[PDB]
Amino acid sequence: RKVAYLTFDDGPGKYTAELLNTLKQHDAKATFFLIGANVKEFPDLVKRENAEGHYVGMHSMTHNFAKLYKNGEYVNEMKEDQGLIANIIGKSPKLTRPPYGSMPGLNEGLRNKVVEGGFKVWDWTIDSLDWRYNKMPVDAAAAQIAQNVLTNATKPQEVILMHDIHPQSVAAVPAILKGLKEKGYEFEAYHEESHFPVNFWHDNRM
Amino acid sequence: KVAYLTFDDGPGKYTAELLNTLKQHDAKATFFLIGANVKEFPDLVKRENAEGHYVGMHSMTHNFAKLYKNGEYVNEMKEDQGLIANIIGKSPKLTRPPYGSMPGLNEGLRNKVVEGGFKVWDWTIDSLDWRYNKMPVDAAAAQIAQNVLTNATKPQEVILMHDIHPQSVAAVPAILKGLKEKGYEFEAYHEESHFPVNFWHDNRM
Amino acid sequence: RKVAYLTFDDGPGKYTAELLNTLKQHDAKATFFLIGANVKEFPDLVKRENAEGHYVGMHSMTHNFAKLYKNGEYVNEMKEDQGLIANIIGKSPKLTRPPYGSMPGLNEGLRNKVVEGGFKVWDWTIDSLDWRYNKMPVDAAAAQIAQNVLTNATKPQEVILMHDIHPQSVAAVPAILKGLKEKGYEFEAYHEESHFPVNFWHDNRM
Amino acid sequence: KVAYLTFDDGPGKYTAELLNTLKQHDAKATFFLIGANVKEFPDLVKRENAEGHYVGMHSMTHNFAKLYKNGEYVNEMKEDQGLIANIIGKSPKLTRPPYGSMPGLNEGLRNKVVEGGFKVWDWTIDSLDWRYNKMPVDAAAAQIAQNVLTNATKPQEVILMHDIHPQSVAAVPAILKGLKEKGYEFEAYHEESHFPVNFWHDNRM
Ligand SMILES: *O=[S@]([N])(=O)C1=NN=C([N]C([C])=O)S1
Ligand SMILES: CC(=O)Nc1nnc(S(N)(=O)=O)s1
Ligand SMILES: [Zn+2]
Ligand SMILES: [Zn+2]
Ligand SMILES: [Zn+2]
């Protein structure tokens, strides 16, 4: 049995909504890591993502490496975010997705507090790199970002990294969805009850 | 089968001469105008719209830094619209980016344009008139025409030309006769007829 | 009457020679814009690029936008860069390729000095974007770089921008020669005997 | 079909018993060792080569930022190779980058690795042994075995495992049994047999 966990980072944003509709059409559930500023300006998008079966998770407030990691504000920022997410969906999500990835910012110090505070941390196994295709016709970048993801679905579980704040990205996801599904994947959201670790540090306390 | 003639960087001194050649061939075209040329040639603007041609927008400065690296595009395009609306009494939606949307019109600016209510048009055929500048008008023109005819192949096509260069205006009469024999029709843009023609393949425009 | 002007920027470098061989294997000629620092340290690659029929032209000494344009060193650096190249190959090439392209750095005033100094200036009609595919498998980067270039060869002449100093770039060169050839192109170097303008300023003085 | 067992981050506590199970099933493997563990367990290092396995480098600091943002990868690999040679009297060339070559081994570094004479190896199969750390070894080993077995399809396979974890070494016995049933042979790397296995698909390594 194969499962493909789509994750969309640094949202929600102006393309988020159209992306929410493409999932709807393929009966496909997904996972969202949101920056707290976008949580404030697009709050109906949060509830929609949630109301529609997807996991809503944290991605810090500032998305700033210096503040997150060298000053150690990761746990604070993820908490404050969870605050906003909760005043909006009525659950405190515990899973977080570090800006720029846990490697190497989330040192053993932070990782210890990460665990002390109740949070889990996801990285990914597949980097669509969608956000680097910002300089070409959109139908074409989409086709490449799709090829990028399709040709790396091998392991029964894969955690695909995307960004819902870029048009080429959302444009890709249809081709992705068709493909993985015909490769035998199912498109599930993260489930806290079902947690398993996925991080660059091999640290199975997250 | 439809062909859309487009004329950038005007109005200017040959625009008059050009408007007549279009009149005589019962040909409607499209004009993307610079604000300062709109300020200086308001007569030509009134006539352009008067004669069935579409009147559209080509910014205020035709300045690459300001439009794209400073994100003034939608600002300049809009103030340009004011200028035009004060002369023809409608506010046009269609903009043609100086130097084209690629890549100056980033995903961000492309939001603001969509949000501001504008479409964006590029072209499919570059007459390349600017190569034959300050050159014998008809020598240059026959070549400008030759460029255009031989890249006319697709059912619809949009043609980049500049009515501020004499060899360009000179190439127009011959282009009209050649494209009709290819089975095209010579139309202006219609806002209700809108369809996307942009390098980004961005169908929100 | 289809001609493709392959151009290679920031060279020469550690992948340049392999590229020179693929070119000889497909008996195809191309154009090289070179950085003076690379001129000096790979001088035998300059002499050979020239020796094998390709055009050798200048790409400045510092590839530094502030110095080239906001200080107006373009003409200077392009003449000094020429100086080195002449001392290796014995001709003073006329054609320059501005770092980051003439738009917008090469203003009315610089462009004046350019025309005054005898030089010509080229940009391109296709940006392969090769240099951006730095963060994925190389065989896969090449393929996208190839489709990027193959799907934009439309005009009778096209000037293709590439960098001979990245591995993914030279790997696309094979696939590209294959595809354009059956799309009807011939691979020539720039000949100053046959110069014509190609720039963003539409300035046919250069 | 040939199957290449690799063991990272060692030697350590369980390396010895692993070596008995390998010797016991007439099985040859590949060990990528860390310089501090080479200094601490020379008899294991000495033993590993002596029993026909390959001994390779997995860095000096297993520290992602030093290796790749500071380009100390080659340096740490050269120094590690040294420590290792002082024990087995040859200098190995095959390295296994901590955290895999993607994406920390840039074109710049991949150059230096090729210049310095080294190859680089990633894996085909990730045992995922690290998930079941500090867990019931019985269960953990069983799942770990399955993980690997359920991914044995390609004629050649390079498997990532860690001989510093009890659950991994415990899994090895059953892994050898399943793959030996799928007709695999269990070879060690040989440098004169080298072929590229890296995420970059850089066939210079
Ligand atoms: O989508 S995010 N959280 O902005 C990113 N996480 N890692 C990224 N890129 C690199 C190079 O680390 S982006
Ligand atoms: C974004 C961008 O401008 N890329 C480049 N344009 N020309 C380049 S050069 N001097 O290496 O060939 S890079
Ligand atoms: Zn992010
Ligand atoms: Zn213009
Ligand atoms: Zn390791």
mmCIF file of N, CA and C in Angstrom, chain D residues 8-9 18 33 81 97 100 102-103 110 144 161 166 184 192 196-197:
data_model
loop_
_atom_site.group_PDB
_atom_site.id
_atom_site.type_symbol
_atom_site.label_atom_id
_atom_site.label_comp_id
_atom_site.label_asym_id
_atom_site.label_seq_id
_atom_site.Cartn_x
_atom_site.Cartn_y
_atom_site.Cartn_z
ATOM 1 N N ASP D 8 26.953 2.690 7.897
ATOM 2 C CA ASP D 8 27.392 4.057 8.169
ATOM 3 C C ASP D 8 27.609 4.297 9.666
ATOM 4 N N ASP D 9 28.297 5.410 9.955
ATOM 5 C CA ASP D 9 28.468 6.015 11.278
ATOM 6 C C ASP D 9 29.241 5.161 12.280
ATOM 7 N N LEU D 18 27.862 -8.118 14.347
ATOM 8 C CA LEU D 18 27.571 -8.007 12.924
ATOM 9 C C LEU D 18 28.598 -8.782 12.105
ATOM 10 N N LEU D 33 33.348 4.634 7.712
ATOM 11 C CA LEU D 33 33.653 4.836 9.118
ATOM 12 C C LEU D 33 33.977 6.295 9.387
ATOM 13 N N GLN D 81 40.604 9.174 5.453
ATOM 14 C CA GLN D 81 41.329 8.179 4.667
ATOM 15 C C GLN D 81 42.714 7.898 5.240
ATOM 16 N N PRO D 97 28.955 10.281 1.653
ATOM 17 C CA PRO D 97 28.755 11.583 2.283
ATOM 18 C C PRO D 97 27.712 11.483 3.375
ATOM 19 N N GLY D 100 23.909 12.027 2.576
ATOM 20 C CA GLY D 100 23.809 11.877 1.138
ATOM 21 C C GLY D 100 24.369 13.078 0.388
ATOM 22 N N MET D 102 23.034 14.633 -2.211
ATOM 23 C CA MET D 102 22.029 15.631 -2.541
ATOM 24 C C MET D 102 21.591 16.332 -1.272
ATOM 25 N N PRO D 103 21.559 17.683 -1.263
ATOM 26 C CA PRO D 103 22.078 18.549 -2.319
ATOM 27 C C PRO D 103 23.372 19.238 -1.896
ATOM 28 N N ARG D 110 31.818 18.736 -5.949
ATOM 29 C CA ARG D 110 31.947 17.537 -6.757
ATOM 30 C C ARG D 110 33.183 17.600 -7.640
ATOM 31 N N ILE D 144 12.658 -3.698 9.952
ATOM 32 C CA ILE D 144 13.800 -3.224 9.179
ATOM 33 C C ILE D 144 14.155 -4.222 8.093
ATOM 34 N N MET D 161 22.543 1.094 5.950
ATOM 35 C CA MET D 161 22.298 0.583 7.295
ATOM 36 C C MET D 161 23.321 1.204 8.226
ATOM 37 N N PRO D 166 21.543 -1.261 17.661
ATOM 38 C CA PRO D 166 21.171 -2.678 17.880
ATOM 39 C C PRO D 166 20.113 -3.233 16.937
ATOM 40 N N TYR D 184 20.340 -12.873 -4.890
ATOM 41 C CA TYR D 184 21.407 -11.891 -4.791
ATOM 42 C C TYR D 184 22.679 -12.523 -4.258
ATOM 43 N N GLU D 192 38.429 -1.231 -8.279
ATOM 44 C CA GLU D 192 38.650 -1.630 -9.659
ATOM 45 C C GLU D 192 37.389 -2.176 -10.307
ATOM 46 N N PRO D 196 29.235 4.326 -10.949
ATOM 47 C CA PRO D 196 28.658 5.496 -10.266
ATOM 48 C C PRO D 196 27.375 5.118 -9.547
ATOM 49 N N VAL D 197 27.267 5.547 -8.283
ATOM 50 C CA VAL D 197 26.003 5.539 -7.548
ATOM 51 C C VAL D 197 25.962 6.815 -6.725
#
